[PDB]
């Protein structure tokens, strides 16, 4: 333990947000910032002007996604793909041999036609040269009424391997909100058991993706991919038995430095992370 003679007390929290805020400002994107991936081709890259994508971590040049790795946990966080990116979005999930895709965008959001959030996983379709196919499977409750619906996408493109992708869709998580630690924990555990089952199938078949640290990474995205996406990722991180001693300061800082200083937007979301870390004897601060 650092030196606060009360790890999860108030002073300890005040200090945590102090360091976090200082980092958010330091990471604040500037016009034509060399650290953040810029928009090329005249096309729209970022869904939000203020929610940028880091440069040296972006998956592909035309998408707002990042290769984030907190401690020993390797995942990929992105924004809800714009229609003009869906074709590229799918090629990433395939090349990645995605063991689990988690969508934390509410059904209501995908519904509102103004938000421009394509319903690309609940229905089948054709996007350019890619031919996807959705299929409904299980439906698991996570408590507090929050529920997850599962689908199985099948990205098929001529001259490429056909990839099946397990999808966990949580449609009752409002925007700018934060589900209780209970739900969150139960949620992180389902994603892990989903990717674990799929990754096994890949190993069994001898795929060469098991030898690449840039593949087989769970892909997660909400709407902007910095709030609800962060809380889930922070929980997955702690759901790992190899990330012992990794503090909350490390979790958040690494997320922000590998994507943008917005990860874990609201405070009600950081708190869910603090409470989970508090029940494991996990440190909040460093040094």
């Amino acid at each position: 333990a650092p030196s606060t003679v009360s790890p999860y007390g108030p002073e300890a929290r005040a200090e945590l947000s102090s360091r976090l805020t200082t980092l958010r400002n330091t990471l604040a994107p500037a016009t034509n910032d060399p650290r953040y991936l810029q928009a090329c081709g005249g096309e729209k890259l970022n869904r939000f002007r203020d929610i940028q994508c880091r440069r040296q971590t972006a998956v592909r040049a035309d998408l707002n996604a990042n290769y984030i790795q907190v401690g020993n946990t390797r995942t990929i966080a992105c924004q809800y793909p714009l229609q003009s990116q869906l074709e590229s979005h799918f090629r990433m999930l395939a090349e990645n041999r995605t063991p689990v895709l988690a969508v934390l965008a509410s059904s209501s959001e995908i519904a509102n036609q103004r938000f421009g959030m394509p319903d690309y996983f609940r229905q089948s379709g054709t996007y350019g040269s890619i031919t996807v196919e959705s299929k409904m499977t299980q439906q698991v409750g996570l408590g507090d009424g929050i529920m997850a619906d599962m689908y199985t996408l099948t990205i098929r493109e001529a001259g490429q391997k056909t990839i099946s992708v397990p999808v966990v869709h949580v449609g009752n998580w409002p925007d700018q909100t934060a589900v209780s630690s209970e739900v969150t924990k139960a949620l992180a555990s389902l994603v892990d058991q989903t990717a674990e089952t799929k990754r096994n199938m890949y190993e069994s078949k001898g795929s060469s993706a098991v030898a690449d640290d840039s593949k087989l990474r769970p892909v997660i995205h909400s709407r902007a991919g910095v709030g609800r996406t962060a809380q889930l990722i922070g929980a997955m991180c702690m759901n790992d038995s190899r990330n012992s001693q990794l503090s909350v300061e490390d979790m958040v800082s690494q997320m922000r430095v590998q994507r943008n200083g917005i990860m874990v937007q609201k405070d009600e979301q950081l708190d869910v992370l603090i409470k989970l870390a508090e029940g494991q004897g996990r440190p909040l601060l460093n040094s």
């Binding site: 041999r97 099948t154 391997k161 056909t162 099946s164 199938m201 890949y202 078949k205 795929s207």
Partner: peptide, 5 residues
């Protein structure tokens, strides 16, 4: 072609 299906 459907190696992993």
């Amino acid at each position: 072609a459907d190696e992993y299906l």
